[PDB]
Symmetry: D2
Subunit: 336 residues, 4 copies
């Protein structure tokens, strides 16, 4: 088994832990935490070995009755690779340590591309990470945009993408963040960061705008794409039905909003009721001459999870063909 360490057992971290553990060629040998809370105790219940960020906080865990295996420094001595799921900006800080231990690592979307030097999205540029040392899985929204823009680019040739991102204010468990009742340009200076992030893995012309609204469940995307070859609605539907980690939903069938989508995710019975796939509203798919309009949604806590599994296989050279990794990841995770 490749031995994977998870530095940061948080929102992404705990889900990546489980997805890695579900594969047949990897196992989790450690997850880390900085504070002794209910997630630290649930890691133990789930069978993981729990490690502590810095050595002087180990006494905290001891005092709360939480068994500790050691520190992150010890956790990395035993890994083949480490998946960094720490807060934005901490991953780059952890990189000095990773290089000093000579261990390879995968970072999440909140890190800057140029601190890591390489960005990953399984369908768009899996081969750019093959046999590399360090790679950044792009963000939840960036990932969601690539899921449908990549297959569009291959089939019809992207001329220009204009997208407006309606972002969730805070994940379900983050109770200290707003807004309670506001719409916030994010940021007001345009265009937003999503464009340039998409360009780190997919070479297309794209401008984005984003705002923040008082919802916690999912982000929502308003996408407009000018293409080179004239598509039809029927052609776009087949492309989305065929592409991996994308599903078509219907408002007519009752999925009129991100709340009803997450309700559907609860009926699917996967880990945490998560929706790793990007749902596209079928009724929204529209063609105006050589321009495609459509709406989609992103379950921000889990869409990047499968991308982390695929990234391990690229970085550790376990599989050279991205489709094989994608497919094996999906089978072990019960992806739709």
């Amino acid at each position: 088994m490749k031995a994977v360490a998870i530095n940061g057992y948080g929102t992404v971290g705990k889900r990546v832990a489980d997805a890695i553990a579900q594969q047949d060629d990897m196992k989790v040998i450690g997850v880390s935490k900085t504070r002794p809370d209910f997630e630290a105790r649930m890691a133990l219940k789930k069978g993981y070995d729990l490690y502590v960020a810095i050595p002087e906080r180990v006494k905290l865990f001891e005092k709360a009755g939480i068994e500790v295996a050691g520190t992150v420094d010890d956790m990395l001595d035993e890994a083949d690779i480490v998946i960094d799921c720490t807060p934005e900006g901490i991953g780059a800080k952890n990189l000095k340590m990773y290089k000093e231990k000579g261990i390879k690592a995968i970072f999440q979307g909140g890190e800057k591309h140029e601190d890591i030097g390489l960005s990953f999205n399984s369908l768009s540029n899996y081969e750019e990470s093959y046999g590399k040392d360090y790679t950044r899985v792009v963000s939840c929204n960036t990932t969601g945009l690539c899921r449908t823009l990549k297959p569009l680019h291959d089939s019809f040739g992207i001329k220009k993408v204009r997208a407006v991102i309606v972002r969730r204010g805070a994940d379900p468990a983050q109770v200290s963040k707003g807004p309670i009742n506001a719409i916030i340009p994010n940021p007001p200076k345009l265009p937003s960061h999503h464009g340039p992030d998409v360009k780190t893995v997919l070479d297309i012309n794209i401008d984005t705008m984003a705002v923040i609204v008082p919802t916690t469940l999912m982000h929502q995307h308003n996408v407009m794409v000018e293409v080179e070859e004239t598509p039809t609605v029927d052609d776009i539907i087949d492309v989305f039905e065929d592409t991996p980690r994308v599903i078509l939903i219907s408002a007519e069938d009752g999925l009129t909003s991100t709340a009803e989508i997450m309700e559907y995710a609860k009926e699917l019975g996967r880990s945490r009721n998560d929706l790793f796939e990007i749902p596209v509203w079928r009724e929204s798919i529209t063609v105006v001459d050589n321009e495609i309009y459509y709406m989609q949604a992103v379950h921000q806590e889990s869409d990047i999870v499968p991308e982390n599994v695929d990234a391990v296989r690229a970085i550790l050279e376990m599989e050279e063909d991205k489709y094989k990794s994608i497919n094996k990841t999906n089978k072990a995770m019960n992806i739709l």
Copy 2:
């Protein structure tokens, strides 16, 4: 096993369906819907036979490509008991039809006690439904209050309960309901109806007040109980730890809010990440004079689920010992 029909496969009904199906002594022989949406299609994927409320709607399902097994009248012919999970007021109307077929039935808390004649809560009055025909499982909030007040009455003797209910405005999937940004007395004439409802199953002196606020996750209760024999905080903690379906949580461990409680439920991994249990904040348990103050929360979509399973064992005379049924329901549901 005993063959159970579920009339009304909605928020409560789809959950009761799965809980019956987990039992070793019961099975679901059908669930019913009135419209062909995604939940109707998920019902077929869980292996349930789908029945349509009225004969003239069978063709709506046929044209949507959803295979139906018959009408509600047909479903009932196959069952030993029907669990009615139809909207408030419809249950009373279905009572007539159940009488005509003769089938025994369980109703939900939205129905009036006067129209059903009996109310039910597993720990406080299981024996009053034993071998009877029809019983009303009390509402989400009423069940939540009984879970902690019954054990308090048994150990210390309740003299008076004063409770203020902070209600969630609408379930997560219900997007057409408010409020978006208000606090609404519910109702403004006091005392509210949770008190009388608790008294249909638990013979105590209780006055309640309630409001609605902009959240969908859980209800939150502020309870103040005057007792006959004043206990210590440790005694109360012992009582709550020993009573079934009540858990103790701590804000010191990170469960500072209903959003973090539901995050905890997602790490538990039961069906739909539900929280069947009533969580009490350990640090809130306080004794002032001869009175106990505490705070708890209720996951309104599922705290009544297990109660419905126990009501089937009482109504059909499968188990005369309320503790043996509660224990068996709990093992099959993976309840804490």
Copy 3:
């Protein structure tokens, strides 16, 4: 003064009544209500004669303690014009009575353009309502897009507009409407109604998309405009500074969201804390080749109010110059 009647003293109608009354050449001779609640009582406190929608409701107001002047039929006999602010679809029903009485009327944006025959926006098509009988002031979002797209068209020649509307779910006082926690495509089939609606007053190529989010304060617009003449950011700023009822704001000065904008509107001290103007985030104004990007917001309860006052001048032939009416309206309303 011209005698103006307000049929429907609701969200828009109470605001239109105060704006009409502030004018030096118009006065309110009555407002109507269907139910005797607190706003019926406040209408009397403001000096307005209060009329009842239907005559068989006069007794209802009288035993509620509310002194009524008569019915809507009596109201129209007192007026030179009626401004209809009834719920969507009722304005077209009232149109029949207006015609039978022989009275000119102005309608709101929720009516269908085809049931009215003429739409109005003060800056883009004032002259088309000059001396006519009936006209529809376009909706809050339609008005907001016209305020900035008209001047852009006049200066650079619009070739194509793409706009994403992020809509508030329900006005502050509307506590029974959601969504509490969701993003809802509105509708899922595109393009949405805003584009065609803009075209009833402004002859341009425009496609819009829209969603509803859990906010009450303001709608927010993401606007992308391809123009004929190459624009510069400083030139657009001058255009927007020069155009009536448009203001430039900055996130650097603390106006980072719709909530801080509305806070700024309470500092202005006009009627009900309203923001009649369309605020454009200064920093969002971007030029890419011949394409302009910018974000704006809309205080949906009141951006249409000043349009109604200019529509009366058009309809009753009080002023043929649209800039004289706009400036006269702005001065009486204390519009920036």
Copy 4:
């Protein structure tokens, strides 16, 4: 006229500045800010002299185009009293400077009673601040509880108060604070701070519990009061109608929530559409034996405002009869 300085032109401070300016015996000689934002610019629009907290930030305001009159030190030399409206804990730090200056001052409810020495509520203990040096106007919720508890105490004699406070998460313009979707015990260790805070101004036995919910508009209170003399619903209604700054509203009249109350406040037309008074739901007034139950709401941004004007008259010995200051304050502020 007494020359008053406002230190901290924020949520409370901007409102206190206007209320002071409205009096015929006081004037505002200055308001202070720390950052040059839209509120600093609006202070100048309103005619106030703007002072900067720290001297090196003077240049910072000047460079932003904001004419400054000097530093806080300068401002305090021009005043007979300073009303501190700085963030919690900051009042205490500033008290040292006020003492060094020999200037009397009023603090807001965020400061600790022990750090200031004395607390104030106009009706409850106005005389305790008569001629003193420093006093603390108690918080929005403490003031709200005292407005109806004091009169009930005087008429019937309070034996015990049990209250559950439903708190708004963040003020309308605060967009960085949550929760978006949760209920948070505040705190989980009971009883809460309101009880002890009421006792700094009113000598009664009271226990409180508080929670935070996703609303911005008003707090809401659920109040249970055991009293010595047997009350009747009608005598309570007369007691609240007769008491200053308390109004009776009804759900039947359309005021069913905090959002509809605030809608009523917008029809009243005072400064910023505030609601300085405490609304009590008339239909919630209930008597059971010798216990009164009732619900009220608080507009947290302004209920403390008139209290601050009365504190100035107490502190500066401008009036010794608390009813004369209350009534004069009410008349100048257009209070019901």
